[model samples]
Target: STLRFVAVGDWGGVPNAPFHTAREMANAKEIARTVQIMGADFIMSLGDNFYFTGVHDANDKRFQETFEDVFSDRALRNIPWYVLAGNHDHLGNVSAQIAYSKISKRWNFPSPYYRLRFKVPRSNITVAIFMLDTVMLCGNSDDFVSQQPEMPRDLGVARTQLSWLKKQLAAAKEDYVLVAGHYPIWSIAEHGPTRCLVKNLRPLLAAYGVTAYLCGHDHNLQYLQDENGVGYVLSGAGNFMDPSVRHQRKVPNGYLRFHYGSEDSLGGFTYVEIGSKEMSITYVEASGKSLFKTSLPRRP
Candidate 1:
């Protein structure tokens, strides 16, 4: 049997703002409803859960106004939500977001970086998910560090985190490994590929035979695979779309054209089903339209 889950990000907008307008709210609700209809096991938030600035703390009303109240559907309430911390999340107290898990029964954020293992129903196979803190790991760049002074600055700590990641990957006993983060290692969107991640993280993923990497921050839905057979699935266009951008540029590797909506405008989510022998992914618009679909068989 396969386990199903949904991935969405860059949502959580202020009331009545252009980014969080009535249409966007309706889209979000529809997406949640679609998830319920599909019987998804859980929802994965690729981060940017809140906009303008993150919650001041776990007790901040934004948690209720933007998250709790917004996604009040009973079906949505029943599933676990694994969330990541995006750049906007770093602008405020990110620790508070982690603390939120303590109070919110479904919010599964335990730390900036961690791992979770889920057993495939009725099978001995285990799926291992490695959630990374890409924002902090790549914050050392001048562009990021200067803007986000609150980001950690210790190079030693960053090294330790990388070391730990290696250990986690090496010791993994699961049949499949999936990685989730807030930034894209390879993207053609306006922000382009996160340089640090491309240089530092991609090698580790390729070395470990990671099945796929799921991320947001580009605010568009994209799929790219490298020669190593690792897939990069981007599903950031959850709420608002930045209209100024154009279509993504083509890469020389196993390139695939962008799909769904325009260059910079799209609102949707990705649904994933993982089984012992194969993994399937589909990108769907908030209006319930299917955009793209693919499946990968287990490697020998």
Candidate 2:
């Protein structure tokens, strides 16, 4: 038996007129096809749900334009989207997005940082996701277009959230423990590693037996394993693609198993399937092609 779901990051398309690009439209089509064929229990939307700026209010048209209309496929309508806010989303009103949870049946954003556990259908296994609001922990970038990830302005907020995260991780007794955030703790791409997370977050994950850290910020798909034995899954290639790899030498030797960020590539997402003993992560392109796959064992 297995539990199946899709993971996408930085997927918000253009905020203007069409509200999406050909890349967004194409990926939407393929995701619809994916759910139809194999069935998805839910979707982990790793923030950046809107491009340029996020929605203004609970009734923001971008919700309908970029979200509703773009991924309007019948197959995708029923599946719940476990959503979060990235730096781009923080640029707008986050409370509005939270308010939207009650309005939309499929848009699930209960709070900035929350937890959800899913049982594999007909199996005695569950996956616990520690959803994080990274921007709230580490402040947004200095400006809109800056490549540098920001540091937390309020240490109190970050400290409080870390306490909450520790409580969650220490108490979770699930088959798989997954931590997710919008900022990558480690990335070989342009944005590279987030210093705030590496210093504050990584240690906790390692101590807590976390299976992987899921995130998006580099506008690419990368799987990097660190010396601490934690897997870093970066899937920011949802709406755009970046080929700049300035920090290639920064990553530890051989930690990077796979990366797909070419100039002529359609955006993609990650497909995760969790069985009783093993969990799988596959990279799927806009056309629904399975580019690469890897797995992690269920932690003891």
Candidate 3:
């Protein structure tokens, strides 16, 4: 059996009229095109679903304007969009995002952080997708991406989240385990590595046999690997573009593998295919071309 999905993040655009950056609209069109051609079961919506400040509440029209209207492509209409909140979303009423899920047909955000498991249609292979709220567990980053986000408002919240994560990771019987969040544990792009996660979350992934960690925050697309075979994918360039990699030296030298950090680049997203033997990830730009791809073996 096999599973296919699109993974993207930081796609929130302006809440005003037209309500999207040029790059955001461009990527939306490309996402639709890519899905139409290759097919997808659902979408792994990495966070930053809203911008500036988040929506005021559950009833905010920004949802319709920035999200609903923007992704109105026919190809994107029916699929489920598993979502999480980003730092910018935390600035507003995140509960509203969770609430809006009830109103939208495709939206599937249930809480600040959670998990979803899927069994490949026919075969016995199971996949576990662990959705994380990095904003809540590690706070939000400011304009500066080098420094770590402020530690979560309460350390205990992070602890509790970690406890739940450990329970889930330890018990994950899925053939492949995927963890996603708004921040990257290891990145070679604009925002670089998230120290707290690199320290706390990284080990659990290695010990628990997680296949890969999906994230977006640095406004670029990239894939890096640690010595233990844990793949870190940065697919954050959904709504905007950034050309900086000032902290390339920050990550361990060899961990940085593929990176698209040119200002010439358009918005981008990641495509993933899970076959019985391996999980393959493709980084695609708004131009509808795959710039990079990497395959990781399924967990033993």
Candidate that scores best on lDDT: 2
Candidate 2 has a TM-score of 0.96
Where model 1 places Cα greater than 4 Å from the true spot, the runs are 15-20, 140-152, 243-247, 261-266
lDDT of 3 by residue, 153-188 (tens): 888888999999999999989999999999889987
Q: Model 2 off-target regions past 4 Å?
A: 142-146
Residue 166, model 1: Cα distance from true site in angstroms: 1.0
Q: How accurate is candidate 3 locally (lDDT)?
A: 0.87
TM-score of 3: 0.96
Tell me which of candidates 1 and 2 scores higher on TM-score.
2
Question: Which lDDT value does model 2 have at 141?
Answer: 70
RMSD of each: 3.0, 1.4, 1.5
Ranked candidates, highest lDDT first: 2, 3, 1
lDDT at position 50, candidate 3: 85
Instruction: Work out the TM-score per prediction.
Output: 0.90, 0.96, 0.96
